Amino acid sequence: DVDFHIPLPGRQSPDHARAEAEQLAWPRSLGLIRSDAAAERHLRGGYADLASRFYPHATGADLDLGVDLMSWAFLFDDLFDGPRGENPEDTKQLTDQVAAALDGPLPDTAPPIAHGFADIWRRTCEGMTPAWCARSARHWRNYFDGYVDEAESRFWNAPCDSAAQYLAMRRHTIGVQPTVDLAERAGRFEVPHRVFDSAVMSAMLQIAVDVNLLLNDIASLEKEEARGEQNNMVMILRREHGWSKSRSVSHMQNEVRARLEQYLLLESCLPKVGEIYQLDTAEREALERYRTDAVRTVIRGSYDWHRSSGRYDAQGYLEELGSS
Ligand SMILES: CC(C)=CCC/C(C)=C/CC/C(C)=C(\F)COP(=O)(O)OP(=O)(O)O
Ligand SMILES: [Mg+2]
Ligand SMILES: [Mg+2]
Ligand SMILES: [Mg+2]
């Protein structure tokens, strides 16, 4: 394994054991897991474990919603490992059918992976402000559009020539922002909307995004070499800077450290940011909950899970999830 500077406390929901025990019931009822071998491959992903560390403040049905999001997100992502992920028109055809759930009811003929997302989104929005739902829906659309962009890069044989071009694409496909959004829903709070848009909070969220994708590109480095993948930060640094493999990995460790140090600086600015936006007492507490239960958790929880998950330790078996 490889070590990273993550000076944040590890946390896990106290209801994790029940959530992990019951995690299969929902994707089974939605037709997303259709065999016992698929169920065991799901269990080996550790997706309830991941959700319990993203959402340690959540228990019960709130934590279950977090588990189902992790379950759905990785099932969805596995539909693009084969030829579909090499074809933007076929990628967009699936993402369009899923994203349609944001706009209204799905037709009964929608593929199972789309009905599963619609069930998550319905539970995500109920009880939040309408403006929160609209903003979170926009985050989902950025995520789905990102899959189309990635399929374009593969189809036209245009690999990313620089770290900046990769991040501009990978910051959306990494799915961190929809994960952070659910921490708010799972915690039954909303960070003040004018502070979510602030330059300081945007920089904190960008660090959370960047750290997650750097962690993921290292944890999945072996798999993606064995498939000749070129849009991986390790590979892209070797092309952009002409460096070896051991240098690019050390560069990514230092970047994680530098961004975590900057993240701490930005946290110390939040009291003055609240003053600038004239937050009252309640809004200040909501901002503090966002900092500790949403942004900090998505950084730290990802670090613990990328080391233990079975995804980083039968192709086409999930194809029927994307068939109308
Ligand atoms: C845990 C994180 C980062 C986010 C929370 C769950 C969500 C919404 C994940 C989005 C999908 C994702 C990051 C991958 F599939 C990993 O990237 P990639 O497909 O390149 O590598 P693999 O994980 O498939 O090997
Ligand atoms: Mg994948
Ligand atoms: Mg993928
Ligand atoms: Mg990866």
UniProtKB/Swiss-Prot annotation:
Changing H306S: 3-fold decrease in activity. Optimum pH is 8.2-8.4. Binds 3 Mg(2+) ions per subunit. InterPro entries: Isoprenoid_synthase_dom_sf, PentlnSyn, Terpene_cyclase-like_2. Changing W305F: 4-fold decrease in activity. 2-fold decrease in catalytic efficiency. Changing F74A: Loss of activity. It comes from the Bacteria. One of its GO terms (molecular function) is metal ion binding. All the mutants retained substantial pentalenene synthase activity accompanied by production of varying proportions of abortive cyclization products such as germacrene A, protoilludene and beta-caryophyllene. This is a true derailment or diversion of the normal cyclization reaction, and not simply the consequence of trapping of a normally cryptic, cationic intermediate. This is Pentalenene synthase. It comes from Streptomyces exfoliatus.
